[PDB]
Write a protein that binds this ligand. Structure first.
Ligand SMILES: CNc1nc(C)c(-c2nc(Nc3cccc(O)c3)ncc2C#N)s1
Lengths: 252, 310
């Protein structure tokens, strides 16, 4: 139901991986890494950012049941991407996903003769994994991403073309850089992204005719306390990611 | 050295009973939950030919059963694994299927009971369309009835989501006998109206006890349809003359609608006849929709729709 795939902070500490000795700091790294792998591959396979994101969620969720020590990100990522693409009606050929995953993880390696046993095996390997992903997710593959809710909000906040782009930027990055999607509903996360997008650009959106802040019209569970704490967390890790913030920095 | 799996139970929790799915269509079994006796239907996901991982068509159907939750739509309880492996869709079991009853000579319907069936069916249609889903496989056989007389629309294998723009959908969908003119003429920008055409064929089947137009090929099918509904004229069907398959398949044009006349025998009720006639309309644009059908005087005249026992 609504609570299956959402976790408390305490539950996030007790991840299947922490159970096999993986530091919580390390683990987040494994996550970000996969996300990158997903992003890089997704772009070379020329799928939509939507699918890339759907794959990324599958990944985050997978690793709340499975441990990194038993399923390496470089194995799951291609599998999950292959899947998300099928689900988002942008299906990519199995051979073609294998090929791109190879050159991504082995820019140097020589691609095997598709006739090889060692190649035939790695095809079967991907497929096995995609299956292990389905059964992990209990066949729940309909995702919902903050992005939908971004437009809905930004529009109704009447915010410049630019402000709006920064907001989706925040969205796509919260997926690579944080586990917000495992703790907060797409709608709530969207408010977080827009809040920060405003703080970053010195936009302030004035109080409705009622005294009610914009976000309340997007979700009444949300509060300034929360938004402030969350954007701080998100902004911090952005500051950590080389060149990420450069992308939206008002250079003028 | 196997792995965790909290959200996907092994199908072995069910004890198999007896293959319902004849013509090995599906490999569908009846089963009994080992602990509680609860009866279910199991469909295995085939994929003998899938060389592209888990069948994308399975993924679609699953997406759709997950979405649709409604009194007149069959219920997917969960999906099960085997533990080489295989995957099973698990459904609430339904006692009868409409085709089995219509074929059985002992079974008998009153006008009152038939009204009820059509009402539940049309309600189901209203619902899935409200939900942007096209069933695309309307037939007697795909319509189940529970031991307590509730109708369920079943088999979403061929079903698919739809929307608004120009649409480019797969054409060769729906059983031949239950397929509507649009598709046979090569339409790929079709919608909910194709399901209602199906509803029509089924409604009639409620009295004739037998699929009404059984063509051997599309040519033949379209022949039969013209011999029942009249012939396809840009006059009768505005802009029908825009399909390539129109004159490159030309069928005879000395033909006038016998929908009411030819069925007059089997159906007594003037209302039931009028409703059928509004479903079996040539131009999809002019074909009645589920909402108006439910409002048709057929459902609001005597005898009023009744419960199901025999
Ligand atoms: C062939 N397509 C189907 N898939 C399922 C799952 C079917 C099904 N069948 C029943 N019972 C049944 C089937 C055939 C004749 C009859 O008298 C009773 N109950 C539930 C489902 C479902 N879903 S049929």
């Amino acid at each position: 139901n609504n609570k299956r795939w959402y976790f408390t902070r305490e539950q996030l500490e007790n991840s299947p991986s922490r159970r096999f000795g993986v530091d919580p700091d390390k683990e987040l790294s494994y996550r970000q890494q996969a996300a990158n792998l997903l992003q890089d591959m997704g772009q070379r396979l020329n799928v939509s950012q939507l699918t890339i994101n759907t794959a990324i969620v599958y990944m985050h969720r997978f690793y709340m049941i499975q441990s990194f020590t038993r399923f390496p990100g470089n194995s799951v990522a291609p599998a999950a991407l292959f899947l998300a693409a099928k689900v988002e009606g942008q299906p990519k050929k199995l051979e073609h996903v294998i090929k791109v995953a190879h050159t991504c993880l082995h820019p140097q390696e020589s691609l095997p003769d598709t006739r090889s046993e060692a190649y035939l095996q790695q095809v079967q390997d991907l497929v096995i994994l995609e299956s292990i992903i389905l059964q992990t997710l209990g066949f729940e593959l309909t995702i919902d991403h903050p992005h939908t809710h971004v437009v809905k909000c930004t529009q109704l906040v009447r915010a410049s073309k630019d402000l709006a782009q920064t907001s989706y930027f925040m969205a796509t990055n919260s997926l690579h850089l944080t586990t917000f999607s495992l703790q907060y509903t797409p709608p709530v996360v969207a408010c977080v992204c827009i809040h920060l997008a405003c703080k970053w650009s010195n936009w302030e959106i004035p109080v409705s005719t009622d005294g009610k802040h914009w976000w309340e019209y997007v979700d009444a569970t949300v509060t300034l306390e929360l938004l402030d704490e969350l954007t701080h967390e998100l902004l911090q890790i952005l500051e950590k990611t080389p060149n990420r913030l450069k992308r939206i920095w008002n250079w003028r | 050295d196997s792995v965790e799996c909290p959200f996907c139970d092994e199908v072995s929790k069910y004890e198999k009973l007896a293959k319902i799915g004849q013509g090995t269509f599906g490999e569908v079994f009846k089963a009994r939950h080992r602990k509680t006796g609860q009866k279910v239907a199991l469909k295995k996901v085939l994929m003998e030919n899938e060389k592209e991982g888990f069948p994308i068509t399975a993924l679609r159907e699953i997406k759709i059963l997950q979405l649709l939750k409604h009194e007149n739509v069959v219920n997917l309880i969960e999906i099960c694994r085997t533990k080489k492996g295989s995957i099973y869709l698990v459904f609430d079991f339904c006692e009868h299927d409409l085709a089995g009853l219509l074929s059985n000579v002992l079974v008998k319907f009153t006008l009152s009971e038939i009204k009820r069936v059509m009402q539940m069916l049309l309600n189901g249609l209203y619902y899935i369309h409200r939900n942007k889903i096209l069933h695309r496989d309307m037939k007697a056989a795909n319509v189940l009835i529970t031991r307590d007389g509730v109708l369920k629309l079943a088999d979403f294998g061929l079903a698919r989501a739809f929307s608004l723009a120009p649409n480019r959908y797969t054409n060769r969908v729906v059983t031949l006998w239950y397929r509507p003119p649009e598709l046979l003429l090569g339409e790929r920008d079709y919608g909910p109206p194709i399901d209602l055409w199906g509803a029509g064929c089924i409604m009639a089947e409620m009295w004739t006890r037998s699929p009404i137009m059984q063509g051997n090929t599309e040519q033949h099918q379209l022949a039969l349809i013209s011999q029942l509904c009249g012939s396809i004229t840009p006059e009768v069907w505005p802009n029908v003359d825009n399909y390539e398959l129109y004159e490159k398949l030309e069928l005879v044009k000395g033909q006038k609608r016998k929908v009411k006349d030819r069925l007059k025998a089997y159906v007594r009720d003037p209302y039931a006849l009028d409703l059928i006639d509004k479903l079996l309309v040539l131009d999809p644009a002019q074909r009645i929709d589920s909402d108006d059908a439910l409002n048709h005087d057929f459902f609001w005249s005597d005898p009023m729709p009744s419960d199901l026992k025999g």
